[PDB]
Design a protein around this nucleic acid. Structure first.
Lengths: 123, 113
DNA sequence: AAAAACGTCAACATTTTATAAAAAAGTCTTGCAAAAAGTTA
DNA sequence: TAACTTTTTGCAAGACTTTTTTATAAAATGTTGACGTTTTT
């Protein structure tokens, strides 16, 4: 896959990947991968403000900020893994609920492309 | 306990009570009790509209809207029960967290001690 | 040894970001007049 | 309860402050088609 300019319209096959150790996001372009890795920390700051003006809760909404940021940056789709398995949007959001009870936040990082095994395994 | 005018600065011993069968909110004055019962269904719209601008999610945040609203209406304190037991502010939220994954919303209604 | 097939890479076509400026929605005072609560005897 | 005083409430008119739009240039991504090479015969 991967067009002449470097875009993967079929996320599963991408080589642009990011993972926070729990969740893995695939992107269609390096442009998006870096857009995501470069500004997610900022996005979290700005995310928490907006939300605090709507409600005050004992929760760490960072992961939720990360999915929203992901969704806003990847214009060509949505494909993610949750600890190795194929994860849907709702499934990543469930993880985000369970994890917002935790005070600290895992950071993100680029990681090499999975590998046919890990891929067939995730489904 | 109750002022002459009928205000309970000690919500723990108030007769102005609203409940949704799962949790129960104690008000300090019938006025606040009704400001709540009369304005919550509308707050849920306003609330989800507001939250929806920050992020779209598969969740039903009404209860969180409910807890938030309670906090802004009851100006003389915060007291609540969760399935019979006294509930800290954090425990009511934990609960609001669970019901987030439930499609329908419990409605509120006045009750008596 | 070519003709057909490929693969690379300018050069021009389109689609997407990035922003600055403007518009518009939404918030946060300030000021009483009114309703609620506190006091008073 | 009644009568009076002091707080909260409700709203309206401005002054501000984010969000949403627009518009437009910049930056990406997409396409096309000579031009050398490769591989098929």
């Amino acid at each position: 896959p991967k067009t002449q300019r470097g875009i993967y319209h079929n996320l599963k096959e991408s080589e642009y990947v990011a993972s926070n150790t729990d969740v893995t996001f695939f992107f269609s372009s390096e442009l998006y991968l870096n857009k995501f890795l470069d500004g997610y920390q900022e996005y979290r700051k700005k995310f928490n403000k907006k939300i605090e003006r709507v409600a005050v809760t004992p929760w760490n909404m960072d992961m939720l900020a990360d999915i929203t940021f992901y969704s806003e940056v990847e214009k060509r789709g949505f494909h993610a893994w949750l600890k190795g398995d194929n994860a849907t949007w709702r499934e990543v959001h469930v993880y985000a609920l369970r994890i917002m009870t935790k005070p600290n936040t895992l950071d993100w990082s680029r990681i090499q492309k999975p590998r046919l095994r890990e891929r067939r395994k995730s489904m």
